[PDB]
Amino acid sequence: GFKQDIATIRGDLRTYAQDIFLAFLNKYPDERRYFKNYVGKSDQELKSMAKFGDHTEKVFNLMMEVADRATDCVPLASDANTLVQEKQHSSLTTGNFEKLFVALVEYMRASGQSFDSQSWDRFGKNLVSALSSAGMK
């Protein structure tokens, strides 16, 4: 279930974070523009870069914190507020986050691993809702 999936992801966080983030960028290539350092680079070029792995690890660490702190896949308002108030998130709308969870759910369903993809879909939905409540346009 959802709780186990957090453990699955955390067990190999760097690998899953890079794979899912790439799945996001590749499904929605318009989103790559937000990430100047990643423009014009293949998956393998990005995986070779320590900074790319470090960035994706930090993002997915926090996502996993928000997921673990949630009750029944409903995230805490304070966590949504953190995400809205991140300086690097200033120009973003909830659609950016919606896209990320579409790609994440797609990745889980395509994977050989037994992810609770429906729970991640619900979690994504509830997070988008919470981002809006915290003031994200």
Residues in contact with ligand HEM by the rule CB under 6 A: 31, 34-35, 55, 58-59, 62-63, 83, 86, 88-89, 92, 96-97, 100
Cβ proximity of 47 and 18 under 8 Å = yes
Nearest to 117 by CA among 130, 104, 98: 104
Judged on CB neighbours under 10 Å (0-12, 13-18, 19+), 120 is: buried
Is 88 labeled as ligand-binding? Answer: yes
Closer CB to ligand HEM, 35 or 116, in the complex: 35
Cβ proximity of 71 and 79 under 8 Å = no
Closer CB to ligand HEM, 8 or 126, in the complex: 126
Give min distance, CB of 90 to ligand HEM, in A: 9
Known binding-site residues for heme b equal: 36, 38, 51, 55, 58, 88-89, 97
